[PDB]
Amino acid sequence: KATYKERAATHPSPVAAKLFNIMHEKQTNLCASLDVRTTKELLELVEALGPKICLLKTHVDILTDFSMEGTVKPLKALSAKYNFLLFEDRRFADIGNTVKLQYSAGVYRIAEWADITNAHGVVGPGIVSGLKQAAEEVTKEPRGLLMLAELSCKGSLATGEYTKGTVDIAKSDKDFVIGFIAQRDMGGRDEGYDWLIMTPGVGLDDKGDALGQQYRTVDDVVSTGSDIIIVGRGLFAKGRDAKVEGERYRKAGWEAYLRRC
Amino acid sequence: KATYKERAATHPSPVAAKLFNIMHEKQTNLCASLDVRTTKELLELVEALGPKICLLKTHVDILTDFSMEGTVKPLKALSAKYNFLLFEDRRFADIGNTVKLQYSAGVYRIAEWADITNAHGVVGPGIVSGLKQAAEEVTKEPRGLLMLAELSCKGSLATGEYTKGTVDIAKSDKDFVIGFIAQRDMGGRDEGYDWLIMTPGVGLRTVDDVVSTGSDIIIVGRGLFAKGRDAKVEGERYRKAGWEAYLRR
Question: Where does substrate bind (chain A)?
Answer without folding.
Answer: 35, 57-59, 89-98, 215, 233
